[PDB]
Design goal:
The structure is cut from a larger assembly and holds seven protein chains of seven kinds. With about 60 residues, chain B is mostly helical. Chain B has helices spanning about 1-30, 40-45. The termini of chain B are far apart. By secondary structure, chain F is an all-alpha fold. Chain F is built from one helix and no strands. Classes of the chains: A mainly alpha (about 90), B mainly alpha (about 60), C mainly alpha (about 110), D little secondary structure (about 15), E mainly alpha (about 120), F mainly alpha (about 20), G mainly alpha (about 120). Chains C and E meet through α1 and α3 of C and α2, α3 and α4 of E. Chain A: It comes from Homo sapiens (Human).
Amino acid sequence: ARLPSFAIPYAIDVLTTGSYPRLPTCIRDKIIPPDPITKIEKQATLHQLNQILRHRLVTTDLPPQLANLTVANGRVKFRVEGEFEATLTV
Amino acid sequence: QLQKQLKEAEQILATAVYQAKEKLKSIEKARKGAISSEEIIKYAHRISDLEMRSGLLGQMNNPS
Amino acid sequence: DRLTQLQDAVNSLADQFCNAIGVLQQCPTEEYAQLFAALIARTAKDIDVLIDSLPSEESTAALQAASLYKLEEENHEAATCLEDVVYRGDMLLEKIQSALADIAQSQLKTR
Amino acid sequence: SPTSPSYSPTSPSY
Amino acid sequence: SALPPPPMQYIKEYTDENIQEGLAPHKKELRKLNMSILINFLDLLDILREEKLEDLKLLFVHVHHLINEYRPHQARETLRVMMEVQKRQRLETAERFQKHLERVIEMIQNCLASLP
Amino acid sequence: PLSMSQNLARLAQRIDFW
Amino acid sequence: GNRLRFQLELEFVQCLANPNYLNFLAQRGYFKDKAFVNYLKYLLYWKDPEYAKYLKYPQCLHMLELLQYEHFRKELVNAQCAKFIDEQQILHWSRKRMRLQQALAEQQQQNNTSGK
């Protein structure tokens, strides 16, 4: 009698090329090729990190040794005369 | 106090921006053919090994 | 949904039409007859459904496209207004981030 | 994943 | 044993050279039907063949294709709403973010008005 | 299965300087 | 081939969905010819609006996906995989089950409603 199958869902999703049905709490599939890299977004995170580092500096009770403070790319810089430098990540 | 206010206002509106980009990639393409689907309807409908070897093609591959 | 049920109702219709005979053709003796009073009674409850399944479809459904169409533009006009908001935020905030970079750098050139 | 008896062969298909 | 198949073949020649040159080519109505259906089952029960049996078949297939027909209407509707609930969130979230942005705008605004 | 803020942890772990 | 290679791809993918059909391809021993790489691409063109308007197995995509990342080809030397990956498909083949139940709860919750 039947086959009544209507399903707009993937109908959309394929209409948009494709769909969610792979791995929602079954992520492994995409997972099992280990996740990739990214270069486009290699900059918004860095800048936002620099800004929150500036904010921590505002919220610090800094010791006198902080002089020659230069901000850089994913590398907190604190250079002293005796010349040990730590770029930690308040 | 300002700042934390911002913080919120931001990652809130950030929430936006995500849903937004949905809005864009869509909004170009939004409602293709605007019927344009009905096929997909029946399509999936009649969409829904030897089977594949009922391979109209492989069926051409019977030797070849 | 609700369609699939009507389909289910038709499936029951036959299903009934069968086993509602099933034992009969194969054979607690009026008990039987209540198995049967049931058999129908089940058929009943079905027909009930049929009846209620029933009141379900709405009857000028062709144009509902053109309705969709007026609506289509709606979805669009949503596009307009909301996006405009998006920009509005976009703008405004910009200022906030700004002032932020201000303070941080400035106070460190103050502290 | 290895729920059980890790060992399976590439294509020894019998 | 029959088998699975191979890949294609002119899959073969393709390498940087080729593909460059190998590119890509009436419901209440029903109500009668069923009430009848009741009724036909009934008469079937009544008198006490082929004639009857095929009868039902025809009739049941009647109601079948009947409903069968109907289905894609609600299909459309699903669309209708589909966009409609799109509109739904659309508006919600809009005024949502906004009203927040406002209240915080005052938040920052009085925060500075908290300064003289 | 969310958060704009969370991303910062995964990007922070993925991200750095045979 | 003119009209043919058209349907040819059509099928080729359409069946590239079933994974076994991978391992078939795989322990079959193929995956060593860029012509596969191309062929990937060549098909990959398939992901176009028109392009699918015949297609039947929306697995095709994920296929290409996987079978676009050579690492899949690397991995699929085995069917153990075929369980796992095939396992997701069997689990999916869901909404119908929810229909039967989510009602069922609706009804019980209704007992509670009538429980008041």
